[PDB]
Amino acid sequence: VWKDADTTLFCASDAKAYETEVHNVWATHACVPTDPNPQEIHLENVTENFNMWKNNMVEQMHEDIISLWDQSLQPCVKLTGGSVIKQACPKISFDPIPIHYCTPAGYVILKCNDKNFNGTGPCKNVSSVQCTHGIKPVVSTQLLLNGSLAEEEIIIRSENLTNNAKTIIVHLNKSVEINCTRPSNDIRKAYCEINGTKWNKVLKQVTEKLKEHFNNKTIIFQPPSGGDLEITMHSFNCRGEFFYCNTTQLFNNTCGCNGTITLPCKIKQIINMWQGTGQAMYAPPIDGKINCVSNITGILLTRDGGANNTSNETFRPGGGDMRDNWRSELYKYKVVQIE
Ligand SMILES: N=C(N)NCCC[C@H](N)C(=O)N1CCN(C(=O)N2CCC[C@H](C(=O)Nc3ccc(Cl)c(F)c3)C2)CC1
Ligand SMILES: *[C@@H]1O[C@H](CO)[C@@H](O)[C@H](O)[C@H]1NC(C)=O
Ligand SMILES: *[C@@H]1O[C@H](CO)[C@@H](O)[C@H](O)[C@H]1NC(C)=O
Ligand SMILES: *[C@@H]1O[C@H](CO)[C@@H](O)[C@H](O)[C@H]1NC(C)=O
Ligand SMILES: *[C@@H]1O[C@H](CO)[C@@H](O)[C@H](O)[C@H]1NC(C)=O
Ligand SMILES: *[C@@H]1O[C@H](CO)[C@@H](O)[C@H](O)[C@H]1NC(C)=O
Ligand SMILES: *[C@@H]1O[C@H](CO)[C@@H](O)[C@H](O)[C@H]1NC(C)=O
Ligand SMILES: *[C@@H]1O[C@H](CO)[C@@H](O)[C@H](O)[C@H]1NC(C)=O
Ligand SMILES: *[C@@H]1O[C@H](CO)[C@@H](O)[C@H](O)[C@H]1NC(C)=O
Ligand SMILES: *[C@@H]1O[C@H](CO)[C@@H](O)[C@H](O)[C@H]1NC(C)=O
């Protein structure tokens, strides 16, 4: 017997107590070892409601990653609130590791194992777990990287699809590689290579999934209509360096177009931080070939408003609220109290 409750979670990780990589160092002192003997408990014939868009776990992971980056990804200068601060900003080792979220005694985590679960409402195949699986805290905009994949079809997630202000999380069932490189020896110029055959296939499937939700209306993709570079570009951290990649070549409805898509990128030093209002300034990039090969496993989308008297729905890549990133992996969990 249980009821919906919120409590203070703890984390578990396979961090190596030697590694200087920042998530390992943080997980070494802020998390416990992962359960070596985990065993979920099926809740035979239990139907339970979930809400990924209203889930305290997401906020608790958000505070962790805020704490993690604050302890690890230190800018030389922060302009937080007008009170500029010039501190140490050594170049670090940065490569996200899986974090597990675990309940204390007297609570458990209910896990939705419905393969088509969209994030909100009833789940019919519920199990109980002590900890989540290992979630990589990958910070990004527009494209969700290195996540899990949807088990069956492409899943559309939104608190309310009808509300255009509510962000859409596309959970892909097939990952699309994105290979980003700042070549060795304009030291901020970089590029991400994406196989255009794969991407346009997956994007076409996304259009067709979106059609099912929008009355078979014409689905149009467009670049973001204004905003900061972090969200108008596909932003992410690669080996400590902030990459900003132009995805206009991705979010065109063009598709003699199917070779390698090369996105122009810039490594940016002055960041509009995702943690909270503030610009952070980092050092110029490290030397050498800076390369991150990531799986695109999700897309963050915002649907244009004022199209109800038209035949089209236009979608633009979104992001900025990293809670939606954690939400994209935490969606099948929810904390309950042992009543
Ligand atoms: N109880 C509640 N429900 N509270 C609501 C929470 C809102 C949240 N606390 C908040 O204040 N917030 C500050 C304003 N925020 C912003 O203004 N922006 C606009 C500028 C860019 C930012 C970007 O995404 N930066 C970025 C940087 C590096 C990388 Cl690698 C990357 F992928 C992305 C996003 C964020 C949330
Ligand atoms: C429920 O999920 C389990 C994994 O926990 C898996 O065997 C299958 O997808 C589902 N099985 C039943 C009997 O519902
Ligand atoms: C998710 O599924 C539930 C089923 O109860 C439904 O009410 C809700 O509208 C669905 N959301 C989306 C975005 O499809
Ligand atoms: C990338 O995707 C492949 C298959 O889609 C998967 O086997 C691999 O584990 C993924 N890599 C990472 C780092 O998640
Ligand atoms: C992914 O989902 C789409 C529907 O959204 C489906 O047509 C396609 O076959 C799926 N691919 C895989 C590998 O499951
Ligand atoms: C979904 O959003 C629309 C648009 O504002 C709103 O009219 C509707 O009431 C919302 N649905 C729910 C369940 O809140
Ligand atoms: C990534 O791109 C670089 C530069 O084009 C290339 O040398 C490397 O082989 C690529 N790696 C993968 C896994 O595609
Ligand atoms: C691009 O993707 C298609 C389909 O997945 C594949 O057949 C092709 O080999 C890929 N191209 C390259 C250059 O890897
Ligand atoms: C991305 O590139 C396109 C085409 O070159 C350009 O029109 C657009 O302004 C670029 N995006 C940004 C945010 O500058
Ligand atoms: C995604 O995972 C791969 C393999 O672990 C890693 O090389 C890459 O840097 C990761 N990408 C990001 C953005 O963390």
Q: Round to whole Å and give the CA distance between 297 and 299.
A: 7
Q: Please list every protein residue whose CB sits less than 6 Å from any atom of ligand 10.
A: 95-96, 138, 145-146, 236, 238, 292-294
String of b and e for 147-169 (b: at least 16 CB within 10 Å)?
A: bbebeeebbbbbbeeeebeebbb
String of b and e for 53-91 (b: at least 16 CB within 10 Å)?
A: bebbbbebbbebbeebbeebbbbebbbbeeeeeeeebee
Backbone angles phi, psi at 27, to 5 degrees: -65, -30
User: Whose CA is closest to 112, among 187, 40, 177, 162?
Assistant: 40
Please enumerate in sequence order all residues whose Cβ is within 8 A of that of 27, keeping only pairs 6 or more positions apart, or say none: 11, 13, 15, 97, 99
Residue 322, exposed/middle/buried by CB under 10 A (0-12, 13-18, 19+)?
buried
Q: Residue 247's domain is classified under what CATH number?
A: 2.170.40.20
Residue 36 corresponds to which amino acid?
P
Asked whether 338 and 2 are in contact (CB, 8 A), the reply is: yes
Ligand sitting nearest the alpha carbon of 193: 7
Q: How far is the CA of 321 from the centre of ligand 3 (A)?
A: 22
What is the separation of C-alpha 278 from the centre of its chain, rounded to a whole number of angstroms? 21
User: Whose CA is closest to 338, among 18, 22, 43?
Assistant: 43
Mutate to test the pocket of ligand 6, among 120, 158, 159, 160 (most ligand atoms within 8 A of CB): 160
Q: Round to whole Å and give the CA distance between 159 and 285.
A: 39
Counting from 1 in the atom list of ligand 4, the atom nearest the Cα of 295 is 1
User: Whose CA is closest to 140, among 307, 297, 13?
Assistant: 297
Q: Considering its fold, how many domains does the chain have in total?
A: 1
Range of the domain at 326: 2-338
Q: Round to whole Å and give the CA distance between 114 and 302.
A: 26
Mapping DSSP onto H, E and C, the string for the chain reads CEEECCCCCEEEECCCCCCCCHHHHHHHHHCEECCCCCCCEECCCCCEEEECCCCHHHHHHHHHHHHHHHHHCCCCEECHHHCCEECCCCCCCCCCCCEEEECCCCEEEEEECCCCCCCEEEECCEEEECECCCECCCCECCEEECCCCCCCCCEEECCCCCCCCCCEEEEEEEEEEEEEEECCCCCCEEEEEEEHHHHHHHHHHHHHHHHHHCCCCEEEECCCCCCCHHHHCEEEEECCEEEEECCCCCCCCCCCCCCEEEEEEEEECEEECCCCCCEEECCCCCCCCEEEEEEEEEEEEEECCCCCCCCEEEEEECCCCCHHHHHHHHCCEEEEEEC
What is the separation of C-alpha 135 from the centre of its chain, rounded to a whole number of angstroms? 10
Query: From atom 12 of ligand 4, which residue's Cα is the shortest distance away?
Result: 146
Pull the structure tokens for residue 281: 């300034």
Mutate to test the pocket of ligand 3, among 50, 115, 120, 213 (most ligand atoms within 8 A of CB): 120
Breaks (C-N over 2.5 A) in the chain follow: 185, 255
Tell me the Ramachandran region of residue 81: left when phi exceeds 0, alpha when psi lies from -120 to 50, beta otherwise: left
Residue 132, exposed/middle/buried by CB under 10 A (0-12, 13-18, 19+)?
buried
Please indicate the experimental technique that yielded this structure.
X-ray
C-alpha angle 147/181/232, rounded to 5°?
A: 65
Asked whether 157 and 169 are in contact (CB, 8 A), the reply is: yes
Q: Round to whole Å and give the CA distance between 251 and 234.
A: 11
Resolution to 1 decimal place, in Å = 1.9
Query: From atom 11 of ligand 9, which residue's Cα is the shortest distance away?
Result: 246
Pull the structure tokens for residue 175: 């990952």
Pull the structure tokens for residue 74: 């230190």
Q: How far is the CA of 113 from the centre of ligand 2 (A)?
A: 6
Mutate to test the pocket of ligand 5, among 148, 151, 154, 155 (most ligand atoms within 8 A of CB): 154
Residue 77 CB less than 6 A away from ligand 3: no
